[PDB]
A and B are shown apart, each in its own frame.
Chain A
Amino acid sequence: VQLVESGGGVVQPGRSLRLSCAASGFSFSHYAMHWVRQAPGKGLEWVAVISYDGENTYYADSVKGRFSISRDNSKNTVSLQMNSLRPEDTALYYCARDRIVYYYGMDVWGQGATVTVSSASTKGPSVFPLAPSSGTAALGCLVKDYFPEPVTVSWNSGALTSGVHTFPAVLQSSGLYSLSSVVTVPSSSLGTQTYICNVNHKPSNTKVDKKVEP
């Protein structure tokens, strides 16, 4: 059972953007589908719902006449068409599954799509090593100057998770984001083990692997 979302990124104010959610692992045509959004640091806000057959749709008043929800039960997809977007629409958008019992509740959620309302252009990041030097050592990767959020960082293709800290991005004065991802490792492991940071910035389709050495 899985819901996979897509379509995030930058959108200028007043312009349009389309979100999509693909289902797999369950009888999709038997479930109603919600969209829920979450502004940075804020709570969950319901946006829209569509019935299993697609005959009924409902909308939050703030998006009425602005958003349109639809589904295709042959392609197992739900879509959220978002028009004349506003700064208040900048948020993480989830699609979520539901079934009539009364709507039971959202028991399966998509991983979310980040929508940023801005006139700023999309830029891919550059990745610089945070080299370990002089029992526990620290190393990392500096992910600098990208737009919009988010970027994801893993280490050694996900084989290294313990002691990993990926910091929330900060907005620089240039209007670009930057973050760091660090890992603590035994100092005796330096020059003996390979450490590679894997950086992904889907909006700019930028994929970077950076080996970090002493």
Chain B
Amino acid sequence: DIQMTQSPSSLSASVGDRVTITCQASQDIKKYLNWYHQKPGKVPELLMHDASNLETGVPSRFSGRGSGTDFTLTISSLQPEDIGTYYCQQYDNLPPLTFGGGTKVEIKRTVAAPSVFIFPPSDEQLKSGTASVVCLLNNFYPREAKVQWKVDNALQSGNSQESVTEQDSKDSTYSLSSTLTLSKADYEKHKVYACEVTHQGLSSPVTKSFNRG
């Protein structure tokens, strides 16, 4: 087939920046190249065809160049919603139709400390015989953050799971959830439940807690 190689694999850039990504074909494809943009959680969107012709409705800050085997996509004024993955695609030959491996785009922004919230398990869940304690870290940057659980001042291990959102398409922040799961019997065996948070935007670790009942 015709192998499509994209570069870089991923990048971080600021709002308003001029950014260029590269696509390379294993053999000459003239100008038979498409570019797609896939936002987090969304379907791919055709940005341009014939290497340089913008689809109708596509923002003017996108432009494509190149012919033969070497192509570029340039964003002249990076916007928060431009995050996600960009794919090139050749249509000089089919089958098979081939995509590049994709280039991931992240927004670099100012440091933002997380807002921290803790949620005790619902009475409804306790009826089932399981207790889920949830710690929420909201709208922070950068993505790196640590969450630790403490039950009656005892450090917890192996009984929690974390989930992190993709970067937000508006404010370029991340949100994080940590869920502590215990049996009902274990939950009622202890009084104070706390989650401790460390992050670049925090001078000291932030702790949120509650007492069962």
Query: Chain A interface (Cβ within 8 Å of chain B)?
Result: 34, 36, 43-46, 49, 58-61, 94, 102-107, 109-112, 126, 128-131, 136, 138, 140, 142, 144, 165, 167-170, 172, 178-180, 182, 184
Contact = CB atoms under 8 A, between A and B. Distances in A.
B94 interface: yes
B43 A43 contact: no
Considering residues A43, A128, A184, which has the most beta carbons from chain B within 10 angstroms of its beta carbon?
Answer: A128
Interface size class of B (residues with CB under 8 A): 35 or more
B208 to A, nearest CB: 11
A111 B43 CA distance: 6
Interface string B160-189: 011111100000000101010100000000
B179 A184 contact: no
A102 B91 contact: yes
Contacts of A104: 49, 91
A184 B96 CA distance: 46
Nearest to A141: B122
A182 B136 contact: yes
B119 A34 contact: no
A102 to B, nearest CB: 6
Given A172-B161, A178-B179, A46 B98 contact: yes
Nearest to A110: B43
B114 to A, nearest CB: 11
A55 to B, nearest CB: 15
Contacts of B96: 46, 58, 60-61
Interface in B72-115: 85, 87, 89, 91-92, 94-102, 115
Contact of A105 (B89, B136, B138): B89
Chain A CB within 10 Å, residue with most, of B43, B94, B100, B102: B43
Interface in B13-53: 32, 34, 36, 38, 43-46, 49
Contacts of A182: 117, 136, 138, 175, 177
A179 B175 CA distance: 13
Nearest to B99: A44
B165 A49 contact: no
In the A-B complex, the 7 residue pairs with the smallest Cβ-Cβ separation, listed nearest first, are A58-B95, A109-B43, A167-B163, A46-B97, A138-B117, A105-B34, A130-B119
A46 B102 CA distance: 14
B179 A180 contact: yes
Given A112-B43, A128-B125, A138-B136, A49 B97 contact: yes
A59 B43 CA distance: 22
